[PDB]
C-alpha cells in the first residue's frame, strides 16, 4: 500500500484542523485514506484495497503538499483534476543573507502584489508566495515559465525582462 507524508508548520494547524473533514471527503471519492497527525504535525495520504486507480495517489501527494504551504483548500483540490499540474519552488537556498532574501522575494511579488498578478495572468497559473516557497498551479508550460522567473528573480535578475518577453509572446499569439 502506497503512502506519502508531509510536515506542516504550527501556524497552519488550526486551518487544516477545521477543513480536514472536506479533505477526506474530497479524497474519499478516490477511496484514498488520509490522516492528520497533530502530535507529529503532519498530513499523510495512502491507498487502500478499494483504490481503483492507484496513480491518483501522486495527485494526493501534491494536495497535502499545497496544503502545507498555505494554499487554500478550494484552490488546492483542483490538483486532483487530470489536467492540473503543480510545483512547489523552494527559494530559501539562493541567498546566504537574510534581509536580502526578503528584498528579492519582495521584488518577486512587487508593490501591491501587482507583478505577481501580472505573472499569474501571463503564465495562466495560480501563484502563492509563502516563507521559503512559491507554490504554483496550472499548465506545465506556464509552470516552467513561473519557475524560470522565480528562480532568476532570486538570483538578482529583474523580472521585468521576463514579464515583457511573456507580454510579447502573449501578443504574438493573436
Amino acid at each position: 500500500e502506497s503512502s506519502f507524508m508531509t510536515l506542516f508548520p504550527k501556524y497552519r494547524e488550526s486551518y487544516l484542523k477545521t477543513i480536514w473533514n472536506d479533505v477526506t471527503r474530497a479524497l474519499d471519492k478516490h477511496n484514498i485514506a488520509c490522516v492528520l497527525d497533530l502530535v507529529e504535525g503532519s498530513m499523510t495520504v495512502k491507498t487502500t484495497r478499494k483504490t481503483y486507480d492507484p496513480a491518483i495517489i501522486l495527485k494526493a501527494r501534491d494536495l497535502i503538499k499545497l496544503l502545507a504551504r498555505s494554499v487554500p483548500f478550494p484552490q488546492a483540490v483542483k490538483i486532483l483534476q487530470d489536467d492540473m499540474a503543480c510545483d512547489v519552488i523552494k527559494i530559501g537556498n539562493f541567498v546566504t543573507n537574510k534581509e536580502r532574501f526578503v528584498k528579492r522575494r519582495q521584488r518577486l511579488v512587487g508593490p501591491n502584489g501587482n507583478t505577481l498578478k501580472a505573472l499569474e495572468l501571463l503564465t495562466k497559473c495560480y501563484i502563492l508566495v509563502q516563507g521559503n516557497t512559491v507554490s504554483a498551479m496550472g499548465p506545465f508550460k506556464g509552470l516552467k515559465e513561473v519557475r524560470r522567473v522565480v528562480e532568476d528573480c532570486m538570483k538578482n535578475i529583474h523580472p521585468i525582462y521576463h514579464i515583457k518577453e511573456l507580454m510579447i509572446k502573449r501578443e504574438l499569439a493573436k
Partner: peptide, 20 residues
C-alpha cells in the same frame, strides 16, 4: 550600484500601468 534594481522597479511599475 543597486540603482539598477531601483530603476527597474519603477520601470516595471509604469510599464504595468501602461499595459492594462
Amino acid at each position: 550600484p543597486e540603482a539598477e534594481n531601483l530603476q527597474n522597479d519603477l520601470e516595471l511599475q509604469q510599464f504595468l500601468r501602461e499595459s492594462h
